[PDB]
Design an enzyme around this catalytic site. Structure first.
Site, PDB file in Angstrom:
ATOM      1  CB  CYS A 106      -0.951   0.030   1.221  1.00 23.83           C
ATOM      2  SG  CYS A 106      -1.917   1.579   1.370  1.00 23.83           S
ATOM      3  NE  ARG A 109       2.456   0.691   3.486  1.00 23.36           N
ATOM      4  CZ  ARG A 109       3.603   0.053   3.610  1.00 23.36           C
ATOM      5  NH1 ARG A 109       3.870  -0.535   4.766  1.00 23.36           N
ATOM      6  NH2 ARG A 109       4.452  -0.043   2.575  1.00 23.36           N
ATOM      7  CD1 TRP A 278      -7.061   9.429  -1.607  1.00 24.74           C
ATOM      8  CD2 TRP A 278      -8.028   9.559   0.410  1.00 24.74           C
ATOM      9  NE1 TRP A 278      -6.135   9.937  -0.746  1.00 24.74           N
ATOM     10  CE2 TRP A 278      -6.699  10.050   0.500  1.00 24.74           C
ATOM     11  CE3 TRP A 278      -8.838   9.565   1.560  1.00 24.74           C
ATOM     12  CZ2 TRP A 278      -6.154  10.534   1.701  1.00 24.74           C
ATOM     13  CZ3 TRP A 278      -8.303  10.045   2.751  1.00 24.74           C
ATOM     14  CH2 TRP A 278      -6.973  10.543   2.811  1.00 24.74           C
ATOM     15  CD  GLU A 283      -5.844   2.557  -6.577  1.00 18.41           C
ATOM     16  OE1 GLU A 283      -6.296   1.446  -6.148  1.00 18.41           O
ATOM     17  OE2 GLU A 283      -5.910   3.632  -5.926  1.00 18.41           O
TER      18      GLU A 283
HETATM   19  C1  HEM Z   1      -6.338   6.651   1.861  1.00 20.37           C
HETATM   20  C2  HEM Z   1      -5.945   6.415   0.609  1.00 20.37           C
HETATM   21  C3  HEM Z   1      -5.271   5.113   0.126  1.00 20.37           C
HETATM   22  C4  HEM Z   1      -4.527   5.090  -0.969  1.00 20.37           C
HETATM   23  C5  HEM Z   1      -4.256   6.311  -1.889  1.00 20.37           C
HETATM   24  C6  HEM Z   1      -4.095   3.733  -1.174  1.00 20.37           C
HETATM   25  C7  HEM Z   1      -3.309   3.309  -2.208  1.00 20.37           C
HETATM   26  C8  HEM Z   1      -3.197   2.001  -2.550  1.00 20.37           C
HETATM   27  C9  HEM Z   1      -2.908   1.487  -3.875  1.00 20.37           C
HETATM   28  C10 HEM Z   1      -2.695   2.341  -5.144  1.00 20.37           C
HETATM   29  C11 HEM Z   1      -2.843   0.171  -3.769  1.00 20.37           C
HETATM   30  C12 HEM Z   1      -2.581  -0.812  -4.900  1.00 20.37           C
HETATM   31  C13 HEM Z   1      -4.011  -1.217  -5.311  1.00 20.37           C
HETATM   32  C14 HEM Z   1      -3.956  -2.029  -6.548  1.00 20.37           C
HETATM   33  O1  HEM Z   1      -2.965  -1.881  -7.310  1.00 20.37           O
HETATM   34  O2  HEM Z   1      -4.929  -2.810  -6.758  1.00 20.37           O
HETATM   35  C15 HEM Z   1      -3.090  -0.196  -2.400  1.00 20.37           C
HETATM   36  C16 HEM Z   1      -3.041  -1.454  -1.903  1.00 20.37           C
HETATM   37  C17 HEM Z   1      -3.470  -1.815  -0.644  1.00 20.37           C
HETATM   38  N1  HEM Z   1      -3.935  -0.990   0.364  1.00 20.37           N
HETATM   39 FE1  HEM Z   1      -4.086   1.006   0.197  1.00 20.37          FE
HETATM   40  N2  HEM Z   1      -4.493   2.955  -0.097  1.00 20.37           N
HETATM   41  C18 HEM Z   1      -5.303   3.771   0.683  1.00 20.37           C
HETATM   42  C19 HEM Z   1      -5.971   3.355   1.832  1.00 20.37           C
HETATM   43  C20 HEM Z   1      -5.938   2.093   2.400  1.00 20.37           C
HETATM   44  C21 HEM Z   1      -6.612   1.705   3.617  1.00 20.37           C
HETATM   45  C22 HEM Z   1      -7.526   2.660   4.427  1.00 20.37           C
HETATM   46  C23 HEM Z   1      -6.295   0.413   3.839  1.00 20.37           C
HETATM   47  C24 HEM Z   1      -6.719  -0.520   4.999  1.00 20.37           C
HETATM   48  C25 HEM Z   1      -7.274   0.047   6.076  1.00 20.37           C
HETATM   49  C26 HEM Z   1      -5.424  -0.034   2.774  1.00 20.37           C
HETATM   50  C27 HEM Z   1      -4.874  -1.295   2.646  1.00 20.37           C
HETATM   51  C28 HEM Z   1      -4.308  -1.755   1.485  1.00 20.37           C
HETATM   52  C29 HEM Z   1      -4.016  -3.133   1.230  1.00 20.37           C
HETATM   53  C30 HEM Z   1      -4.199  -4.343   2.187  1.00 20.37           C
HETATM   54  C31 HEM Z   1      -3.444  -3.158  -0.170  1.00 20.37           C
HETATM   55  C32 HEM Z   1      -2.975  -4.392  -0.942  1.00 20.37           C
HETATM   56  C33 HEM Z   1      -4.260  -5.004  -1.499  1.00 20.37           C
HETATM   57  C34 HEM Z   1      -3.897  -6.196  -2.321  1.00 20.37           C
HETATM   58  O3  HEM Z   1      -2.812  -6.806  -2.067  1.00 20.37           O
HETATM   59  O4  HEM Z   1      -4.711  -6.509  -3.244  1.00 20.37           O
HETATM   60  N3  HEM Z   1      -5.211   1.010   1.943  1.00 20.37           N
HETATM   61  N4  HEM Z   1      -3.204   0.952  -1.641  1.00 20.37           N
HETATM   62  C1  QJ7 Z   2      -8.455   0.634   0.312  1.00 21.32           C
HETATM   63  C2  QJ7 Z   2      -7.944   0.963  -1.079  1.00 21.32           C
HETATM   64  C3  QJ7 Z   2      -7.585   2.271  -1.466  1.00 21.32           C
HETATM   65  C4  QJ7 Z   2      -7.113   2.471  -2.779  1.00 21.32           C
HETATM   66  N1  QJ7 Z   2      -6.753   3.676  -3.270  1.00 21.32           N
HETATM   67  N2  QJ7 Z   2      -7.027   1.446  -3.654  1.00 21.32           N
HETATM   68  C5  QJ7 Z   2      -7.357   0.191  -3.296  1.00 21.32           C
HETATM   69  C6  QJ7 Z   2      -7.261  -0.889  -4.380  1.00 21.32           C
HETATM   70  O1  QJ7 Z   2      -7.612  -2.192  -3.938  1.00 21.32           O
HETATM   71  C7  QJ7 Z   2      -7.760  -3.254  -4.820  1.00 21.32           C
HETATM   72  C8  QJ7 Z   2      -8.150  -3.018  -6.160  1.00 21.32           C
HETATM   73  N3  QJ7 Z   2      -8.302  -4.040  -7.032  1.00 21.32           N
HETATM   74  C9  QJ7 Z   2      -8.087  -5.308  -6.627  1.00 21.32           C
HETATM   75  C10 QJ7 Z   2      -7.701  -5.608  -5.309  1.00 21.32           C
HETATM   76  C11 QJ7 Z   2      -7.450  -7.042  -4.903  1.00 21.32           C
HETATM   77  N4  QJ7 Z   2      -6.140  -7.452  -5.407  1.00 21.32           N
HETATM   78  C12 QJ7 Z   2      -5.779  -8.867  -5.384  1.00 21.32           C
HETATM   79  C13 QJ7 Z   2      -4.621  -9.212  -6.332  1.00 21.32           C
HETATM   80  C14 QJ7 Z   2      -4.557 -10.712  -6.555  1.00 21.32           C
HETATM   81  C15 QJ7 Z   2      -5.254 -11.281  -7.628  1.00 21.32           C
HETATM   82  C16 QJ7 Z   2      -5.204 -12.658  -7.826  1.00 21.32           C
HETATM   83  C17 QJ7 Z   2      -4.460 -13.468  -6.955  1.00 21.32           C
HETATM   84  C18 QJ7 Z   2      -3.760 -12.910  -5.883  1.00 21.32           C
HETATM   85  F1  QJ7 Z   2      -3.036 -13.706  -5.054  1.00 21.32           F
HETATM   86  C19 QJ7 Z   2      -3.812 -11.523  -5.690  1.00 21.32           C
HETATM   87  C20 QJ7 Z   2      -7.532  -4.574  -4.379  1.00 21.32           C
HETATM   88  C21 QJ7 Z   2      -7.823  -0.066  -2.002  1.00 21.32           C
END
Ligand code: HEM
Ligand code: QJ7
Ligand code: HEM
Ligand code: QJ7
Ligand code: H4B
Ligand code: H4B
Ligand code: ZN
Lengths: 407, 411
Positions: A106, A109, A278, A283
């Site tokens: 993420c 953070r 947000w 994305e």
């Molecule tokens: C506040 C604005 C936030 C931004 C801008 C942000 C940004 C991102 C982005 C760009 C990703 C990659 C997503 C993707 O490529 O699919 C991500 C992954 C992730 N974020 Fe954030 N995030 C935010 C908030 C949060 C919050 C509030 C949480 C949990 C409370 C969180 C937990 C995670 C987790 C667990 C991943 C990895 C998800 C995965 O492996 O599929 N994020 N973050």
């Molecule tokens: C909370 C939050 C904020 C922010 N700005 N963006 C996000 C994006 O989150 C996700 C968006 N699209 C897909 C996911 C889930 N990703 C799983 C990736 C994956 C796919 C298949 C197998 C695997 F092991 C892992 C999360 C989440």
């Protein structure tokens, strides 16, 4: 045993000690790096509980106090008796904030300590879950001024009584296979959409149909609910230069809300913990719109820009990519819906890393995920060495419910 | 043991068995991934196993494993090691070795080309002037008036580590950089310290923005000596844009020939510390990194000014816009002057085909995702979506310390 990371653009070197508190395994070995792979009892629980309460009590400057020793005994007593235990509200909030703090994939953070935690451990039915979620959605959306939030449903017990949100995010679009061969709407959700239909959903079969929630309470069969349309803030996509852009008919939703992950705190497992922040603009504009297996709009955009699509070397895909991403950002910003661009988000993350290293001794980061899917090397994170490791509390992937669920 | 990788765009799943032949370490453990860290005399005892493993690999490739020539060659190397402490490669083994170091280079996107490598044997070389001559011939051969040909030139191997051949330059052709008293840099900031060395050794620096650096060449552990590559051998491309006529007035050019000269080639336990190799450029190497990195030429602002982009907020994506136009320009310029170049779409697409064929025919293809994915437009290239497995196969190319840090100066 003590590790250095270097930024190759600024020469700033940081020392990582936090990794020695690393617990789970990475998938890598000394023989092979799996850095780019998407996924590489009573006796079990008390160490996990102790490790967590130790970090908690240490964080409020009360490590080794009577209150610390008392709590450890109480949890020990409860595990020996009940086979699980319950977190104090304070521990739950700390746990959730730290699972986000520890999310190595993420980039956002810097925000980790501003997380609104909704304790839904008293929830018992899918209608209750629906209510908690509508409430989370409305709170987080905040009419476009987005606030990070998580809602935490009851913990795993015997594993046959799991709360689960079947949706991958709270707000997503349906995908449908047609006689054509092409896909209408989002191809990422074809399978989930079919599961909805087969459970009873009235699909309008459009390009941007907000999916219904499929909510499973207490290991019961999941049930459908439409999110009140009025709680789903969507943004029409237009371009500040190209007057034709609006007629592609593109929209996206304001609220990114991951709903299929598992929160682990002090050994306890929370299988329904939807959380939201947000968007970073890439994305939607890079991944959602331009992945070949998603909306895949590059071809159609490049045509309206009348670019030479004859040879890849004219960089028409790259030109169109930038414009699409300009349009995403401009649209969200014009409608006053919080969004961050990849320059701003990655610069904040560098600052956050410096804070974490200074303050905490490190920051686990997965470079492969942190570097934005466009313009990689013009963002500072590209030049930043990172160390990836697993700390707990954590968010984890979990098997999709339909492969698990006994009907 | 089998390992699988999946491409998340195509659902193609591949199975790696080649990783079982991996020897050296990655830097990672079960508890920490170091996938994004840039860098995470031998004894007879360790040498003969290294030799044996290599000759077993060579003899397998030619379908003569276990043959009389195979067995005789092992015995001959064994004896040579016991008598002399080292051994000499046959020309055929050196060629095989150099091609395989490239085939094994997990950070190289260009490996579809690995079997087409011109190997120049420079092991009879004895002096810096000798090295200079060999390097001119490599450059003239590889350049081929713009129809670039991959090549490597292999100077004598390490002996006691006190007689090393080294090319002190990090690439054969690179531009000088000069730190000004006001703290600004003229020319390429990457090459400041090396330029300073060259000036100390006696180079008369013209002090411009694109001064081709002299070669600084070390033979047989002696002090290195300077030489000027003949300018007629250095093919350069002035950079212009197909639509923007002011682009030429930025005064940009680049050289055609990318030629790495500071790496070490390991083949069967032998170490070739001077082994310059060259291919041709992928455009982003110049357009993204050389021109637009902050610590390099840093032209994003000047280009964006001239495009009249909104520069008051990052969210206009003015940098992303200018970056694409510069990269269009690099590709246009090279193509117009008929100098070999590949764009990042073509190169990554070719790599995926190479990688799949390698899995099919070889059982694997070690690849470092961090390096393979292009530094712009990552996810619109197929490699972004490809899982990869990174591990170390020998023969290999390796980094080595900069020679100014280790050299014992004779005077
Ligand atoms: C506040 C604005 C936030 C931004 C801008 C942000 C940004 C991102 C982005 C760009 C990703 C990659 C997503 C993707 O490529 O699919 C991500 C992954 C992730 N974020 Fe954030 N995030 C935010 C908030 C949060 C919050 C509030 C949480 C949990 C409370 C969180 C937990 C995670 C987790 C667990 C991943 C990895 C998800 C995965 O492996 O599929 N994020 N973050
Ligand atoms: C909370 C939050 C904020 C922010 N700005 N963006 C996000 C994006 O989150 C996700 C968006 N699209 C897909 C996911 C889930 N990703 C799983 C990736 C994956 C796919 C298949 C197998 C695997 F092991 C892992 C999360 C989440
Ligand atoms: C045929 C044209 C080639 C292309 C387009 C190409 C492409 C590339 C690129 C883009 C990189 C990353 C460079 C960087 O970011 O600094 C690279 C790395 C590398 N390539 Fe190639 N390559 C080619 C030929 C070769 C040849 C002929 C060899 C050796 C015989 C080679 C061996 C390597 C090695 C060892 C690396 C890693 C360098 C490092 O870690 O600094 N490549 N390749
Ligand atoms: C043969 C070839 C073809 C082609 N198209 N491109 C290349 C590019 O090769 C390089 C360009 N610039 C620098 C290098 C050397 N890389 C050094 C990376 C590094 C820097 C600092 C510390 C470290 F441990 C490692 C290689 C080489
Ligand atoms: C195979 C590879 O690991 C995969 O495509 C990854 C790369 N980096 C990513 N980075 C982010 N932020 N999100 C993703 O879905 C991915 N996908
Ligand atoms: C810290 C990080 O590993 C470093 O900036 C890397 C990232 N990926 C790269 N990829 C390529 N091809 N070349 C590079 O110099 C780098 N630099
Ligand atoms: Zn690793």
């Amino acid at each position: 045993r003590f590790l250095k990371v270097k930024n190759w653009e600024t020469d700033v070197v940081l020392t990582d000690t936090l990794h020695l508190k690393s617990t789970l395994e990475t998938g890598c070995t000394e023989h092979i790096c799996m850095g780019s792979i998407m996924l590489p009892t009573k006796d079990q629980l008390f160490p996990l509980a102790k490790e967590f309460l130790d970090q908690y009590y240490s964080s409020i400057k009360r490590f080794g106090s009577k209150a610390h020793m008392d709590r450890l005994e109480e949890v020990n007593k409860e595990i020996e008796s009940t086979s699980t235990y319950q977190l104090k509200d304070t521990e739950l909030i700390y746990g959730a904030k730290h699972a986000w703090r520890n999310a190595s994939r993420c980039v956002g953070r810097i925000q980790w300590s501003k997380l609104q935690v909704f304790d839904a451990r008293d929830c018992t039915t899918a209608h209750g879950m629906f209510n908690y979620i509508c409430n989370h959605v409305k709170y987080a959306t905040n009419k476009g001024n987005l606030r990070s939030a998580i809602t935490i449903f009851p913990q795993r017990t015997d594993g046959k009584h799991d709360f689960r949100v079947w949706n991958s995010q709270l707000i997503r679009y349906a995908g449908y296979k047609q006689p054509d061969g092409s896909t209408l709407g989002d191809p990422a959700n074809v399978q989930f959409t079919e599961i909805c239909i087969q459970q009873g959903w009235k699909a309008p079969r459009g390009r941007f149909d907000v999916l219904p929630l499929l909510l499973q309470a207490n290991g019961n069969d999941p049930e459908l609910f439409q999110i009140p349309p009025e709680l789903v803030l969507e943004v029409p996509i237009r371009h500040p230069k190209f007057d034709w852009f609006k007629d592609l008919g593109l929209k996206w939703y304001g609220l990114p809300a991951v709903s299929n992950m598992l929160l682990e705190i002090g050994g306890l497992e929370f299988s329904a913990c939807p959380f939201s922040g947000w968007y970073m603009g890439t994305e939607i504009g890079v991944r959602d719109y331009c992945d070949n297996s998603r909306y895949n709009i590059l071809e159609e955009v490049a045509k309206k820009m009348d670019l030479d699509m004859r040879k890849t070397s004219s960089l028409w895909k790259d030109q169109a990519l930038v414009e699409i991403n300009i349009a995403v950002l401009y649209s969200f910003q014009s409608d006053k819906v919080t969004i961050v661009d990849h320059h701003s988000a990655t610069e904040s993350f560098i600052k956050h890393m410096e804070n974490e290293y200074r303050c905490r001794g490190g920051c686990p980061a997965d470079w492969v995920w942190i570097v934005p899917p466009m313009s990689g090397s013009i963002t500072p994170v590209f030049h930043q060495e990172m160390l990836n490791y697993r700390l707990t509390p954590s968010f984890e992937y979990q098997p999709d419910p339909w492969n698990t669920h006994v009907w």
